[model samples]
Target: GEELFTGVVPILVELDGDVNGHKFSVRGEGEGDATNGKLTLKFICTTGKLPVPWPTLVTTLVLCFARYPDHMKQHDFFKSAMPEGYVQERTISFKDDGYYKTRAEVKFEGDTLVNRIELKGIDFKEDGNILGHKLEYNFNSVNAYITADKQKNGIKSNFKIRHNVEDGSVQLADHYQQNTPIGDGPVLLPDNHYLSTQNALSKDPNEKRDHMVLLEFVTAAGIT
Candidate 1:
């Protein structure tokens, strides 16, 4: 019940599944804090479908901001925190084994291919990592600050101490998006379904950096 770090609150999504005989999970089980605004999320798509994770989450943010009639019933503060045009459906049924998938099938006002995603394995576990460290989402605010614990050195301290804080202005950490694998799902329209990304905790002067992707959600109308 006490206020922890402010600004960007960290959230990790752990996904473990097989990809046509290939098995993988978040190796090393790295550690960090909700150092971003409470909306920060870590992507672990060991499911081998890198393409789907981007649009899957993109579809999620767009749909939430689009506020279609059929969306997830609000159980988190984000539901009420967002203003106009916000909705979420934790799970959706489309293929075999109805209700056994977490897909985002978004479309225009008349179901005209807005965004789509697909995967047989379990998906998106927000607010915590495989280590069970969860963020206290007591506040609903935009993550404007950056975490300093493990930005440059790429080493996170286990000790509980006050970490550094800075303004989050860096745009891209790694332009290539090299490591991220993609899946073959329906393409999402850019005009309506827009997703924002930035360096997790970066600073200038350092040309090369590590993998720290930020998953930002903003409405098409330009609302945080």
Candidate 2:
């Protein structure tokens, strides 16, 4: 067998639309937990002179990985990342463009190795001029067997967005199967995408866990 990465590695995710040199980067550290590990993720942004289109943009960023755990679990990617009453900020320094600039970091989370992201906001300028209004988002597996919860304005709601296998794929719902646009959403991939993407989840799996992929779907985000 070949050696694998068992720890967190910074990943750069691209976004759609004409937002100039812009991208999302997850950079943080991880530690072993319950034989697996605890994952820590922080956000960083890269952009040019143009101001970011904080509002009016609803795009999905897909994250895919190779392996995973047997049993799948649910997690709220937004709850911890975006707590109420507190704003998170990150400063990005670009050599090409002088002067270090700061920006608001979009909060998100996942239960497995790879996860998806949906960014929607308003008036997110540097000097705390974020007129970001509320927004909703939902996430689920293509097959419908896997699912997650919904968050508004980067905060978790009281309800959970659970779904099961229906005809073949899950139907879009405003709160049941799908969600409103604006905040960050999470994708419920198989335990594989959930656990195998990185080394953060080393929970040795049993033989019962499954693995598959959505070959037809695109898997990549933008980079500054």
For candidate 2, report its TM-score: 0.23
| Index of the highest-TM-score prediction | 1
Which run of 10 residues does model 2 get worst, by summed lDDT? 211-220
TM-score of candidate 1 relative to the true fold: 0.26
* 221 Cα displacement, candidate 2 (Å): 26
lDDT of 1 by residue, 9-29 (tens): 222233333323344433112
What's model 1's lDDT at 187? 19
The TM-scores, one per candidate, come to: 0.26, 0.23
